[PDB]
Amino acid sequence: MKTAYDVILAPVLSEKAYAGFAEGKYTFWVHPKATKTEIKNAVETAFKVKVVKVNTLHVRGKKKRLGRYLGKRPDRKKAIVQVAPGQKIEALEGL
Amino acid sequence: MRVKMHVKKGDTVLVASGKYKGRVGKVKEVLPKKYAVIVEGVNIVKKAVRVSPKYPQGGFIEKEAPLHASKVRPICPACGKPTRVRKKFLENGKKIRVCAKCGGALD
Amino acid sequence: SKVCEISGKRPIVANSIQRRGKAKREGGVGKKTTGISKRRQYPNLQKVRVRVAGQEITFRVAASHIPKVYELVERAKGLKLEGLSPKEIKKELLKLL
Amino acid sequence: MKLSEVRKQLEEARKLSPVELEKLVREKKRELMELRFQASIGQLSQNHKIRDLKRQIARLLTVLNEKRRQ
RNA sequence: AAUCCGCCUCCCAACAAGCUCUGCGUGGUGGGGAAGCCCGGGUGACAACCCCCCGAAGCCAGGGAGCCAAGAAAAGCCUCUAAGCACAACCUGCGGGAACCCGUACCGCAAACCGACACAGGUGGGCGGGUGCAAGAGCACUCAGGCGCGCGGGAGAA
RNA sequence: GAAUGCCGGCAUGAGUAACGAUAAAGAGGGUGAGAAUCCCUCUCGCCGUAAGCCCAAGGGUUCCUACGCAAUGGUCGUCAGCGUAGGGUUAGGCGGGACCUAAGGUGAAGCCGAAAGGCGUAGCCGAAGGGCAGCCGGUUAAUAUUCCGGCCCUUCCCGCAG
RNA sequence: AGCCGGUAGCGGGCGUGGAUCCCUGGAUGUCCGAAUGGGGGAACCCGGCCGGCGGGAACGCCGGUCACCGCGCGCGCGGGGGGAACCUGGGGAACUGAAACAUCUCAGUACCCAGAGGAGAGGAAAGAGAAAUCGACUCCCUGAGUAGCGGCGAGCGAAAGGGGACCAGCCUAAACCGUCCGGCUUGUCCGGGCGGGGUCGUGGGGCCCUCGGACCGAAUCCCCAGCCUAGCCGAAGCUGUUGGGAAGCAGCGCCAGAGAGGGUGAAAGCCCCGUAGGCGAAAGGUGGGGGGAUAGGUGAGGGUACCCGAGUACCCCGUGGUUCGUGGAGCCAUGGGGGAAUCUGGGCGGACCACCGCCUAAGGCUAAGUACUCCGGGUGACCGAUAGCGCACCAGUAC
Ligand SMILES: [Mg+2]
Ligand SMILES: [Mg+2]
Ligand SMILES: [Mg+2]
Ligand SMILES: [Mg+2]
Ligand SMILES: [Mg+2]
Ligand SMILES: [Mg+2]
Ligand SMILES: [Mg+2]
Ligand SMILES: [Mg+2]
Ligand SMILES: [Mg+2]
Ligand SMILES: [Mg+2]
Ligand SMILES: [Mg+2]
Ligand SMILES: [Mg+2]
Ligand SMILES: [Mg+2]
Ligand SMILES: [Mg+2]
Ligand SMILES: [Mg+2]
Ligand SMILES: [Mg+2]
Ligand SMILES: [Mg+2]
Ligand SMILES: [Mg+2]
Ligand SMILES: [Mg+2]
Ligand SMILES: [Mg+2]
Ligand SMILES: [Mg+2]
Ligand SMILES: [Mg+2]
Ligand SMILES: [Mg+2]
Ligand SMILES: [Mg+2]
Ligand SMILES: [Mg+2]
Ligand SMILES: [Mg+2]
Ligand SMILES: [Mg+2]
Ligand SMILES: [Mg+2]
Ligand SMILES: [Mg+2]
Ligand SMILES: [Mg+2]
Ligand SMILES: [Mg+2]
Ligand SMILES: [Mg+2]
Ligand SMILES: [Mg+2]
Ligand SMILES: [Mg+2]
Ligand SMILES: [Mg+2]
Ligand SMILES: [Mg+2]
Ligand SMILES: [Mg+2]
Ligand SMILES: [Mg+2]
Ligand SMILES: [Mg+2]
Ligand SMILES: [Mg+2]
Ligand SMILES: [Mg+2]
Ligand SMILES: [Mg+2]
Ligand SMILES: [Mg+2]
Ligand SMILES: [Mg+2]
Ligand SMILES: [Mg+2]
Ligand SMILES: [Mg+2]
Ligand SMILES: [Mg+2]
Ligand SMILES: [Mg+2]
Ligand SMILES: [Mg+2]
Ligand SMILES: [Mg+2]
Ligand SMILES: [Mg+2]
Ligand SMILES: [Mg+2]
Ligand SMILES: [Mg+2]
Ligand SMILES: [Mg+2]
Ligand SMILES: [Mg+2]
Ligand SMILES: [Mg+2]
Ligand SMILES: [Mg+2]
Ligand SMILES: [Mg+2]
Ligand SMILES: [Mg+2]
Ligand SMILES: [Mg+2]
Ligand SMILES: [Mg+2]
Ligand SMILES: [Mg+2]
Ligand SMILES: [Mg+2]
Ligand SMILES: [Mg+2]
Ligand SMILES: [Mg+2]
Ligand SMILES: [Mg+2]
Ligand SMILES: [Mg+2]
Ligand SMILES: [Mg+2]
Ligand SMILES: [Mg+2]
Ligand SMILES: [Mg+2]
Ligand SMILES: [Mg+2]
Ligand SMILES: [Mg+2]
Ligand SMILES: [Mg+2]
Ligand SMILES: [Mg+2]
Ligand SMILES: [Mg+2]
Ligand SMILES: [Mg+2]
Ligand SMILES: [Mg+2]
Ligand SMILES: [Mg+2]
Ligand SMILES: [Mg+2]
Ligand SMILES: [Mg+2]
Ligand SMILES: [Mg+2]
Ligand SMILES: [Mg+2]
Ligand SMILES: [Mg+2]
Ligand SMILES: [Mg+2]
Ligand SMILES: [Mg+2]
Ligand SMILES: [Mg+2]
Ligand SMILES: [Mg+2]
Ligand SMILES: [Mg+2]
Ligand SMILES: [Mg+2]
Ligand SMILES: [Mg+2]
Ligand SMILES: [Mg+2]
Ligand SMILES: [Mg+2]
Ligand SMILES: [Mg+2]
Ligand SMILES: [Mg+2]
Ligand SMILES: [Mg+2]
Ligand SMILES: [Mg+2]
Ligand SMILES: [Mg+2]
Ligand SMILES: [Mg+2]
Ligand SMILES: [Mg+2]
Ligand SMILES: [Mg+2]
Ligand SMILES: [Mg+2]
Ligand SMILES: [Mg+2]
Ligand SMILES: [Mg+2]
Ligand SMILES: [Mg+2]
Ligand SMILES: [Mg+2]
Ligand SMILES: [Mg+2]
Ligand SMILES: [Mg+2]
Ligand SMILES: [Mg+2]
Ligand SMILES: [Mg+2]
Ligand SMILES: [Mg+2]
Ligand SMILES: [Mg+2]
Ligand SMILES: [Mg+2]
Ligand SMILES: [Mg+2]
Ligand SMILES: [Mg+2]
Ligand SMILES: [Mg+2]
Ligand SMILES: [Mg+2]
Ligand SMILES: [Mg+2]
Ligand SMILES: [Mg+2]
Ligand SMILES: [Mg+2]
Ligand SMILES: [Mg+2]
Ligand SMILES: [Mg+2]
Ligand SMILES: [Mg+2]
Ligand SMILES: [Mg+2]
Ligand SMILES: [Mg+2]
Ligand SMILES: [Mg+2]
Ligand SMILES: [Mg+2]
Ligand SMILES: [Mg+2]
Ligand SMILES: [Mg+2]
Ligand SMILES: [Mg+2]
Ligand SMILES: [Mg+2]
Ligand SMILES: [Mg+2]
Ligand SMILES: [Mg+2]
Ligand SMILES: [Mg+2]
Ligand SMILES: [Mg+2]
Ligand SMILES: [Mg+2]
Ligand SMILES: [Mg+2]
Ligand SMILES: [Mg+2]
Ligand SMILES: [Mg+2]
Ligand SMILES: [Mg+2]
Ligand SMILES: [Mg+2]
Ligand SMILES: [Mg+2]
Ligand SMILES: [Mg+2]
Ligand SMILES: [Mg+2]
Ligand SMILES: [Mg+2]
Ligand SMILES: [Mg+2]
Ligand SMILES: [Mg+2]
Ligand SMILES: [Mg+2]
Ligand SMILES: [Mg+2]
Ligand SMILES: [Mg+2]
Ligand SMILES: [Mg+2]
Ligand SMILES: [Mg+2]
Ligand SMILES: [Mg+2]
Ligand SMILES: [Mg+2]
Ligand SMILES: [Mg+2]
Ligand SMILES: [Mg+2]
Ligand SMILES: [Mg+2]
Ligand SMILES: [Mg+2]
Ligand SMILES: [Mg+2]
Ligand SMILES: [Mg+2]
Ligand SMILES: [Mg+2]
Ligand SMILES: [Mg+2]
Ligand SMILES: [Mg+2]
Ligand SMILES: [Mg+2]
Ligand SMILES: [Mg+2]
Ligand SMILES: [Mg+2]
Ligand SMILES: [Mg+2]
Ligand SMILES: [Mg+2]
Ligand SMILES: [Mg+2]
Ligand SMILES: [Mg+2]
Ligand SMILES: [Mg+2]
Ligand SMILES: [Mg+2]
Ligand SMILES: [Mg+2]
Ligand SMILES: [Mg+2]
Ligand SMILES: [Mg+2]
Ligand SMILES: [Mg+2]
Ligand SMILES: [Mg+2]
Ligand SMILES: [Mg+2]
Ligand SMILES: [Mg+2]
Ligand SMILES: [Mg+2]
Ligand SMILES: [Mg+2]
Ligand SMILES: [Mg+2]
Ligand SMILES: [Mg+2]
Ligand SMILES: [Mg+2]
Ligand SMILES: [Mg+2]
Ligand SMILES: [Mg+2]
Ligand SMILES: [Mg+2]
Ligand SMILES: [Mg+2]
Ligand SMILES: [Mg+2]
Ligand SMILES: [Mg+2]
Ligand SMILES: [Mg+2]
Ligand SMILES: [Mg+2]
Ligand SMILES: [Mg+2]
Ligand SMILES: [Mg+2]
Ligand SMILES: [Mg+2]
Ligand SMILES: [Mg+2]
Ligand SMILES: [Mg+2]
Ligand SMILES: [Mg+2]
Ligand SMILES: [Mg+2]
Ligand SMILES: [Zn+2]
């Protein structure tokens, strides 16, 4: 069955993602098929906040090899939610 | 469906062939994919280890080399003789290994 | 060109044989074939329009089975055909075959 | 998860109702996300927990399905 | 069907206006801001931000004239009424909420595209500064910017 | 033992021709096991209706950073569009879709054809044409009309008023 | 009794309370694909209706549902697409051979198309063809390279009969009887559905008199044996010696319904895996064998002369099929024209006629014996990495 916890996969860990916490912008890896609207809801019910803005972008898998064997990593989508003025997502403030 | 192993961890086996013919020991391990058993203190080999956290001071370690399972014979816990194994059905009727010399269970 | 909705008569392939010379039976040396090539013989298809149940039904039918259309119309009387589409009438009609 | 814990889980689940089953999957799907988040920052040494939870959820939804099937 | 559109008649208006849409200027405000000098950044700086000239192929635009070869459709949009419905509905103004999916890196006259090659070839559109030469997108030099072309060093025969 | 045989390997030509525009180089400093070839500075030269800049195709990570130099680079290589890893592409207003039609395609009705299939007013699809609301600046190593700031705007839902 | 695939490692777990693994059944099963809500450059996009989630009306997500065609009274059922060969049907070449070439050949092959299915086709005489005979069909041997066909060239090439494999026969239409429904030109009507009846070549049936009054039995259904999809039991050797290693050599034994074969440090009946001989299914599949049921089946004179498959037979024209290439050219089939009869009817026995015989057209089905090999297994005087499949290897890949 579909729950918010199916839509939010993992937090994005990088200099750039962390830089957002200050202004209330949390960046998650979400399921590649999930809509801004649905991510807004998912984040709201999982981290008890008010999502105000949602930015999403697709992230192509990097082609990578192991010896003879060429391949690709999985494609991912990342979402950047803006919580309402003053709120916070403590699980991410983290760090 | 499964490899047939006539021997197991850690019944007591006679090593009947190879450099260590005659030795007796517990089966420390059974490796069915390779069809092999590790017998305690049988088939020792000198392996080089790099100077590493796991082994500072480096040099060498001793390891037990696996034996092809066919080289090994369980020793019967009743008669103390090395034996072929037979199956006997109990009343359960679970089945068990029994020595082929006397009739004793081998577990 | 095509198929009789009644008899099922289809276009068939026939050879067209060209011959030359005098038949033996007429004292000639015999007939020589100077060509064979395939051709088709079509059914003599024509249109028959009929009113049945105040609707205009039309059949594409080989001339030999032109009377079989009208015979179908006759057997049609025992049928509850009014209100139906002309596709529907023709189906019922045809089913009577 | 231990084999006996698995039987235990099934017996207990089977006693539940659909609605109770749904509530509980949601809770487990939630508990998995935490595991994920922890796994991703290198703070889950106990990583077998992930395969575990995932199968619990499977067992549960499996049983939810059982109920609703007839 | 129509109060619309077309056609006929009459009255007032008419190189006016009015109304309406756009361009440009201004405009609360917000920004930027050199050389040089110190190690992309600081400073210069409270930076100054003004006048005159040139001036488009761009804009006002659906402008104007001429010509013959006589120069898309459909929706948006306005209007007309039909079933309906007229506590509805639509218009205008205000307020609150709502606003999805895909692309977006980088090359792009080329060492990343088409040419088996980091190939003197091929590749559509826009910008393309200054001076002089009658003009120019020509030519020379040169700004911004970018390069010296991924073997070199000598020698100084045919 | 021969088929200008087939497949493979290795010779010869030969340290030979060549190293791909005659725009052009020089020095000092740095780095490193190693430097004409990488970084920095100064000097010199070339392009400048381009050999600069921006879009669209096509390409598909080649972008940025760290660590590397076996091979790839016509030489070298400490460098690189190369190896490994990590990061990086953020939109109601840009583009396309939830709008329109063009050729053409497809195709209720319908027509035709041994089978396969061919046609066909409507309709539907089909755009680099029509329609449609975003400008200036700041910020990153790397994205920005997308984030931020400032000032503007569009549609949909609901409501209130007229 | 180990295990968390190839796959070791870091980091963690599970298993005699029976894991991993194997077989069967079930659940889950994003998107595309016949692809089927609609669109589309397959794997993306965009909807309607019902229900649900969120603060939820806009927005978005979740569940269900929505293509078209056919058949049957909106609803039911079905179709669609794939499959290596095999099969039928609808179309159908050429090189080549003829030492040139046209008829002829190649060949009804290659190939395209449709369709089936585990086979398909064919099948229960309007047969054969000379026997006073045979007795559905299919398939093998033979008949026979015969008969014949043939620019009587090149070439092509039957059938009956005999021996075998398998074995099986049925259902209808019509007459006539009953019933419902419909028509307008009111019934002794005509027509359509359904039921009854009937099914054949010594002709059979219908109707009307006379007489007579249980056995067979499925190709459908049910049960079961047997089979498949995992498995399991399975005899007998120790010691010495050379040697890295014994299974070699030596000594003394033993099993054998098992001395097939493969492994084990070299060369092993007795170490391992096996082998002979046996055993095994809760579940799914099969079940042509066994059993049972059901459908269905079955008389004799006499009279009547009602019925016995129509654009059909039949004749002519044009063609194909057959061994038959226009030939003395019948037969089977049919594109065109003409066009009957119901047993005193019709077709056939190679033009035609007579005689003498054979057979009953114009409706349908029908196991088996036969073809094939994607798949599983067994076996090779088959290959052994330039071989053997294109591929022993991550190949229909790189390129
Ligand atoms: Mg699911
Ligand atoms: Mg940063
Ligand atoms: Mg996106
Ligand atoms: Mg986006
Ligand atoms: Mg992967
Ligand atoms: Mg066993
Ligand atoms: Mg010993
Ligand atoms: Mg057991
Ligand atoms: Mg002719
Ligand atoms: Mg003649
Ligand atoms: Mg004569
Ligand atoms: Mg002739
Ligand atoms: Mg007519
Ligand atoms: Mg005719
Ligand atoms: Mg006629
Ligand atoms: Mg389990
Ligand atoms: Mg009118
Ligand atoms: Mg009026
Ligand atoms: Mg202005
Ligand atoms: Mg203004
Ligand atoms: Mg400044
Ligand atoms: Mg400065
Ligand atoms: Mg200052
Ligand atoms: Mg100062
Ligand atoms: Mg004009
Ligand atoms: Mg038009
Ligand atoms: Mg339209
Ligand atoms: Mg009204
Ligand atoms: Mg508003
Ligand atoms: Mg949508
Ligand atoms: Mg961008
Ligand atoms: Mg860019
Ligand atoms: Mg470049
Ligand atoms: Mg650029
Ligand atoms: Mg050029
Ligand atoms: Mg250009
Ligand atoms: Mg460039
Ligand atoms: Mg190139
Ligand atoms: Mg290249
Ligand atoms: Mg170069
Ligand atoms: Mg070039
Ligand atoms: Mg050009
Ligand atoms: Mg000038
Ligand atoms: Mg000049
Ligand atoms: Mg000049
Ligand atoms: Mg100039
Ligand atoms: Mg020039
Ligand atoms: Mg410069
Ligand atoms: Mg140069
Ligand atoms: Mg010289
Ligand atoms: Mg020779
Ligand atoms: Mg040569
Ligand atoms: Mg040569
Ligand atoms: Mg050769
Ligand atoms: Mg050779
Ligand atoms: Mg060769
Ligand atoms: Mg060679
Ligand atoms: Mg050489
Ligand atoms: Mg030399
Ligand atoms: Mg030379
Ligand atoms: Mg020379
Ligand atoms: Mg030379
Ligand atoms: Mg060259
Ligand atoms: Mg030279
Ligand atoms: Mg060069
Ligand atoms: Mg050069
Ligand atoms: Mg020159
Ligand atoms: Mg130096
Ligand atoms: Mg260098
Ligand atoms: Mg160097
Ligand atoms: Mg230098
Ligand atoms: Mg150089
Ligand atoms: Mg440099
Ligand atoms: Mg120049
Ligand atoms: Mg210039
Ligand atoms: Mg490429
Ligand atoms: Mg790469
Ligand atoms: Mg970049
Ligand atoms: Mg890179
Ligand atoms: Mg780079
Ligand atoms: Mg570096
Ligand atoms: Mg290198
Ligand atoms: Mg190198
Ligand atoms: Mg080197
Ligand atoms: Mg390396
Ligand atoms: Mg190289
Ligand atoms: Mg090199
Ligand atoms: Mg090169
Ligand atoms: Mg270095
Ligand atoms: Mg490079
Ligand atoms: Mg790189
Ligand atoms: Mg914005
Ligand atoms: Mg736009
Ligand atoms: Mg919408
Ligand atoms: Mg569209
Ligand atoms: Mg359209
Ligand atoms: Mg078409
Ligand atoms: Mg059209
Ligand atoms: Mg439309
Ligand atoms: Mg457009
Ligand atoms: Mg446009
Ligand atoms: Mg738009
Ligand atoms: Mg603006
Ligand atoms: Mg950039
Ligand atoms: Mg960036
Ligand atoms: Mg903004
Ligand atoms: Mg009001
Ligand atoms: Mg693994
Ligand atoms: Mg470990
Ligand atoms: Mg472990
Ligand atoms: Mg059990
Ligand atoms: Mg299964
Ligand atoms: Mg999903
Ligand atoms: Mg699908
Ligand atoms: Mg679809
Ligand atoms: Mg479609
Ligand atoms: Mg709803
Ligand atoms: Mg909310
Ligand atoms: Mg809602
Ligand atoms: Mg949601
Ligand atoms: Mg849905
Ligand atoms: Mg739906
Ligand atoms: Mg089909
Ligand atoms: Mg099929
Ligand atoms: Mg055929
Ligand atoms: Mg056909
Ligand atoms: Mg044919
Ligand atoms: Mg065929
Ligand atoms: Mg042809
Ligand atoms: Mg020929
Ligand atoms: Mg040939
Ligand atoms: Mg010949
Ligand atoms: Mg010839
Ligand atoms: Mg010849
Ligand atoms: Mg010739
Ligand atoms: Mg020929
Ligand atoms: Mg031939
Ligand atoms: Mg032929
Ligand atoms: Mg073939
Ligand atoms: Mg098919
Ligand atoms: Mg069979
Ligand atoms: Mg059959
Ligand atoms: Mg059949
Ligand atoms: Mg019969
Ligand atoms: Mg003979
Ligand atoms: Mg002759
Ligand atoms: Mg022939
Ligand atoms: Mg004959
Ligand atoms: Mg025979
Ligand atoms: Mg026979
Ligand atoms: Mg047989
Ligand atoms: Mg009747
Ligand atoms: Mg009647
Ligand atoms: Mg009746
Ligand atoms: Mg009779
Ligand atoms: Mg039957
Ligand atoms: Mg055994
Ligand atoms: Mg044994
Ligand atoms: Mg020794
Ligand atoms: Mg021994
Ligand atoms: Mg001996
Ligand atoms: Mg034997
Ligand atoms: Mg043997
Ligand atoms: Mg052997
Ligand atoms: Mg060895
Ligand atoms: Mg021997
Ligand atoms: Mg031997
Ligand atoms: Mg052996
Ligand atoms: Mg046996
Ligand atoms: Mg056996
Ligand atoms: Mg009688
Ligand atoms: Mg009669
Ligand atoms: Mg008859
Ligand atoms: Mg008939
Ligand atoms: Mg004829
Ligand atoms: Mg013929
Ligand atoms: Mg003749
Ligand atoms: Mg004939
Ligand atoms: Mg005919
Ligand atoms: Mg007769
Ligand atoms: Mg007669
Ligand atoms: Mg006949
Ligand atoms: Mg005849
Ligand atoms: Mg005759
Ligand atoms: Mg006859
Ligand atoms: Mg006969
Ligand atoms: Mg049949
Ligand atoms: Mg049978
Ligand atoms: Mg058969
Ligand atoms: Mg077979
Ligand atoms: Mg096989
Ligand atoms: Mg061999
Ligand atoms: Mg090889
Ligand atoms: Mg090979
Ligand atoms: Mg070899
Ligand atoms: Mg193979
Ligand atoms: Mg190979
Ligand atoms: Mg490969
Ligand atoms: Zn014992």
Side-chain angles (χ1 to χ4, degrees), chain A, chain B residues 1-53 55-56 58-107, chain C residues 2-86 88-94 96-97, chain D residues 1-22 24-70:
Chain A
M1 66 176 309
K2 195 178 195 178
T3 76
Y5 318 93
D6 287 321
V7 185
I8 313 304
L9 313 193
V12 167
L13 315 174
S14 76
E15 237 42 90
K16 193 177 196 187
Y18 302 152
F21 293 171
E23 37 193 6
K25 293 175 190 286
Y26 300 103
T27 306
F28 304 85
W29 292 116
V30 305
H31 180 105
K33 238 165 234 180
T35 296
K36 285 188 191 175
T37 296
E38 184 184 1
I39 297 153
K40 147 142 143 222
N41 285 9
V43 164
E44 282 187 354
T45 105
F47 306 106
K48 315 232 164 294
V49 296
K50 175 85 181 324
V51 172
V52 129
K53 184 190 164 59
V54 188
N55 280 21
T56 61
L57 34 31
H58 272 287
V59 183
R60 312 187 53 157
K62 290 176 180 225
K63 282 180 181 71
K64 286 273 167 163
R65 81 182 52 100
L66 216 207
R68 285 209 22 177
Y69 308 111
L70 285 163
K72 186 175 147 282
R73 279 189 197 158
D75 285 350
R76 326 208 279 308
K77 181 173 189 175
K78 77 205 186 180
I80 305 163
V81 309
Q82 171 64 269
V83 297
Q87 308 184 341
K88 287 194 285 163
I89 307 189
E90 210 55 64
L92 256 50
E93 291 289 0
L95 286 85
Chain B
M1 184 201 65
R2 156 184 87 99
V3 190
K4 306 310 187 70
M5 281 293 191
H6 61 132
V7 127
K8 52 180 186 177
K9 185 199 170 57
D11 52 12
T12 294
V13 304
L14 170 56
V15 166
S17 73
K19 213 169 61 184
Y20 297 71
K21 62 167 150 318
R23 301 278 190 106
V24 182
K26 308 286 267 169
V27 174
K28 296 180 45 185
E29 197 174 19
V30 167
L31 313 170
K33 292 186 206 324
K34 197 208 157 292
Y35 202 63
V37 296
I38 302 286
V39 172
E40 209 168 44
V42 169
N43 234 188
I44 285 279
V45 292
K46 188 200 292 173
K47 149 158 230 38
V49 296
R50 303 260 202 268
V51 149
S52 59
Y55 305 91
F60 305 79
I61 74 186
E62 284 173 332
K63 188 193 294 198
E64 280 125 331
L67 277 181
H68 188 274
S70 69
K71 310 174 84 48
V72 138
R73 310 175 51 188
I75 303 277
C76 182
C79 68
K81 302 203 51 195
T83 185
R84 272 177 270 130
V85 352
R86 297 195 163 103
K87 313 304 186 75
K88 179 149 154 287
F89 295 95
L90 268 9
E91 285 321 315
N92 312 248
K94 295 303 107 64
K95 171 183 67 191
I96 48 160
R97 310 180 293 139
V98 301
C99 149
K101 293 257 182 73
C102 77
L106 304 186
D107 274 5
Chain C
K2 220 178 209 328
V3 188
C4 178
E5 291 170 349
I6 300 295
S7 54
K9 275 174 177 168
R10 207 142 249 287
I12 71 175
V13 178
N15 279 323
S16 172
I17 305 167
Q18 303 300 322
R19 309 181 190 260
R20 262 192 175 196
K22 218 213 275 185
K24 299 201 189 209
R25 66 196 276 126
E26 305 183 22
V29 96
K31 316 289 269 194
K32 284 352 192 114
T33 300
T34 221
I36 307 177
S37 62
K38 287 173 172 307
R39 57 155 302 193
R40 309 171 94 212
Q41 289 177 315
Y42 297 105
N44 194 3
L45 279 188
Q46 316 282 337
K47 280 169 177 178
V48 181
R49 272 166 336 160
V50 178
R51 295 208 78 85
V52 161
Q55 292 277 35
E56 172 141 332
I57 312 310
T58 126
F59 289 86
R60 305 170 72 249
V61 44
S64 59
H65 291 52
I66 294 189
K68 204 83 184 303
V69 167
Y70 288 87
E71 161 184 334
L72 282 176
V73 158
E74 286 268 275
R75 299 174 66 174
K77 309 299 188 39
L79 271 49
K80 317 181 88 152
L81 284 179
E82 255 137 52
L84 294 165
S85 71
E88 278 143 33
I89 297 175
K90 196 172 177 193
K91 273 196 183 172
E92 291 313 311
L93 273 184
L94 252 5
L96 280 186
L97 263 166
Chain D
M1 222 172 93
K2 269 169 269 255
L3 237 190
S4 47
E5 287 163 352
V6 164
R7 302 189 197 101
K8 198 62 207 299
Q9 199 187 18
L10 286 163
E11 300 187 22
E12 276 302 301
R14 271 156 176 150
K15 272 171 195 176
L16 291 174
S17 82
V19 182
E20 277 157 325
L21 277 174
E22 286 183 347
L24 173 62
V25 156
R26 190 167 301 115
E27 294 167 13
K28 296 198 156 287
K29 273 173 177 280
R30 181 198 162 82
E31 184 185 325
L32 207 176
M33 195 197 72
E34 290 166 26
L35 290 199
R36 275 204 299 281
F37 279 54
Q38 268 179 331
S40 62
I41 72 183
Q43 298 187 349
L44 191 79
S45 35
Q46 283 208 315
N47 58 50
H48 74 279
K49 288 174 83 191
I50 300 178
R51 177 165 301 146
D52 261 355
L53 223 208
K54 250 156 64 181
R55 307 189 184 178
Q56 292 183 36
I57 293 175
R59 261 181 296 262
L60 288 189
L61 292 167
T62 280
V63 167
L64 198 176
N65 197 273
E66 282 177 358
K67 289 301 176 66
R68 317 245 235 207
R69 265 212 310 286
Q70 8 98 265

